[PDB]
Design a protein around this ligand. Sequence first.
Ligand SMILES: Oc1cc(O)c2c(c1)O[C@H](c1cc(O)c(O)c(O)c1)[C@H](O)C2
Ligand SMILES: [Fe+2]
Length: 849
Amino acid sequence: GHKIKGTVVLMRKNVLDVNSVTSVGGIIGQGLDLVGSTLDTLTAFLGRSVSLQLISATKADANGKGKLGKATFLEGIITSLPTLGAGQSAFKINFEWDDGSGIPGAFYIKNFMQTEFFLVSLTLEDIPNHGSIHFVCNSWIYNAKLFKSDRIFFANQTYLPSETPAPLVKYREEELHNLRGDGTGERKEWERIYDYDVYNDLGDPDKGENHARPVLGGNDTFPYPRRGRTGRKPTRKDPNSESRSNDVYLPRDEAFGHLKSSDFLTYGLKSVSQNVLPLLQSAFDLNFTPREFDSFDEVHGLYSGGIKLPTDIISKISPLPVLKEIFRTDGEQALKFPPPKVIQVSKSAWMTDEEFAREMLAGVNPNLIRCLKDFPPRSKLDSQVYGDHTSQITKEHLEPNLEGLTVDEAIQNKRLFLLDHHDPIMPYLRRINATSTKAYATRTILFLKNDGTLRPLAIELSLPHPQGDQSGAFSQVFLPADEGVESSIWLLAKAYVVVNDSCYHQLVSHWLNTHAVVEPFIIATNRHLSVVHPIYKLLHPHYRDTMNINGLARLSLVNDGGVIEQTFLWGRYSVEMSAVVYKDWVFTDQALPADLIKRGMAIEDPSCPHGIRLVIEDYPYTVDGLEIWDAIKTWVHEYVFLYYKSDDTLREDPELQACWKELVEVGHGDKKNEPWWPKMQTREELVEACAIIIWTASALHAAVNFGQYPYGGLILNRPTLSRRFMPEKGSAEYEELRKNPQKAYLKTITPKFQTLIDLSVIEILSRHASDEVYLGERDNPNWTSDTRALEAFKRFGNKLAQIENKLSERNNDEKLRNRCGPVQMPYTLLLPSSKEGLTFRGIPNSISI
Ligand SMILES: Oc1cc(O)c2c(c1)O[C@H](c1cc(O)c(O)c(O)c1)[C@H](O)C2
Ligand SMILES: [Fe+2]
């Protein structure tokens, strides 16, 4: 005889699902923390509803396996616990245990209730010499008849792939097996099967020929990372292309629910290109709304008075959950947009050459600039002439009013920089310009001023086929001007570079280098590292809600009818080109230090703070991020050496080795024969690999994503597509620059409808949910009983707080004005913590939006 006491903490569906959470149109950071033991609806879990069965960790049966200790059904609700949270419900359960039937280390759970629930945790108040044994669950439990195998959950202690407790070695290998799933069938909602598949979901051949898109991945031309496998039948008119669907599968638990209504920022997107985009396209295709902005004064009226809309649309969008606040409205007829930080102090400073060069260092896309080593700039294209030629920017185009010295001197002293956007677009420039869009293949040189500020020198506007093709060097360079038509020409020359930059930032810097590249790691980790594994615990939080956002992405963002194809320059060839750029992606080069060196923005110097010397030290992104990357690198190292006693210990880890093999050969399989892949044979290799994953999921994504609306919320500052070529000679358009240069500008960039779609999308993306878990020492509960890892994590959070303070002081340092610029916008993109809204700060643990 004997009875172990258990406290089961769970959350009902009603507390976490959107359709029902339609009633949380307000602040619910708590609100009594309604236990459910309140307004007892929790008696339903009391009948013969839920059974738990403890499993032994120190006592095995006949053939290997651990030992089951009877099935026990729930009983009573514990109405209040000091550690009880909002939306949570707690239940008491006494298991009959007995020494000889050792110490528990896992448990099976059966849900008989039909409607699923979210199991939070289980805590046992033992018998032998043990304190409370805690089980961190955080998993949705569906009815027991549809699983073939019982849902099992392990205890707190993390064990290496030895799988340690012999009685649980079988239970560990089996759960992992179940996570993989054979690679067969159409995946269902309640399933937890992680598998790979190529990008063949984006297009829709059945609806036409114009609706087909190239298969990405699994070929030489368009190599690409794998995405989470879903098992829909092929498309009728194409067997290698998967049929579309309004509901895309992703393993359950990977789809995070929320307590508050406006925290479902994914249901925001899905509802915008669904019930906001179709309706708005009918407002333009009428007359209640002008199709083109007439002046600069009209674009700004978007944040003040807003776009007076008809009730035929403005009330059909008004209810819609999550879209609470965002789509401001004075009641009837008005779809207002909040003012971006870029125009709050000065609405005219975005036009300066300084807040153009400045944004390449502290902007939305700050990791593309590079030091010029040998002028003129060269193309990396093939036997196409200019790719064997170079840029047509003469040694005679450089050095204006600033200082004045030779070209070679400016290079030996490393003051000349480049912002090359030539290669990626050139190959498709013929096809793209043959549509409503008209773009250039841009190149721009920058000079490092004596006062640390960067200044534009020459902008090269290239076009394909000077006469035929094989040459492509049909370019023209433009120089900076301050008055007359020359300035209105230079203003447009910058608009041609930005249209290229925001699109490169679109699918590459943001979608490719972050979103797409990370998904394969989530799948490889879940398929091969047991939840009990140390590396699984270190990585886990940085994968939060990632397969969910990428699922929506394939559904509404980067698909055939998508939002990215309508709003961006590359248009229909958007993702294909990112597959082309992917050819150049190198894992180890994603490391911040290695990236800075590769672009020539830094030189190794041990005498310096982080082992590297920076050319242009007034580089916010780089300077701030180096502190953060370092913090990550120190934390992973402390953590990895905490578990691995030697290198051989790593090599003989079957879970990690099977994980790395599959990630290389399958996840990012198109690059399997690449030599730069770390060969998990060293401990500092695992350290590096984990640091790059975490950097990418948190700090890289934050820098590249949260400054989207603050900088690009003004379509003027960061336009997404160009429709006209540069006005020439005496044309009625050249003369229009003279008459009305603002109309000239507006007719050269994103039209009104696409401007309104762009803003409503990057505005959702640029916001933090109120329940976001940041890098700042943040985690949900107590993921491990390993006190040493607990302390190492506390140390991580501490240095994150010092760094935060450290970063604020730099923003106040009047000598580093590349942090603020003419726009007075303190670069706070890399500060660890942040509050709820559209704050221009905060580093989430992962790619959550
Ligand atoms: O989590 C998200 C949310 C999004 O809505 C998007 C994501 C990732 O990435 C791509 C993308 C394209 C762009 O053009 C951008 O500017 C951008 O930031 C991201 C996608 O097509 C739109
Ligand atoms: Fe994102």
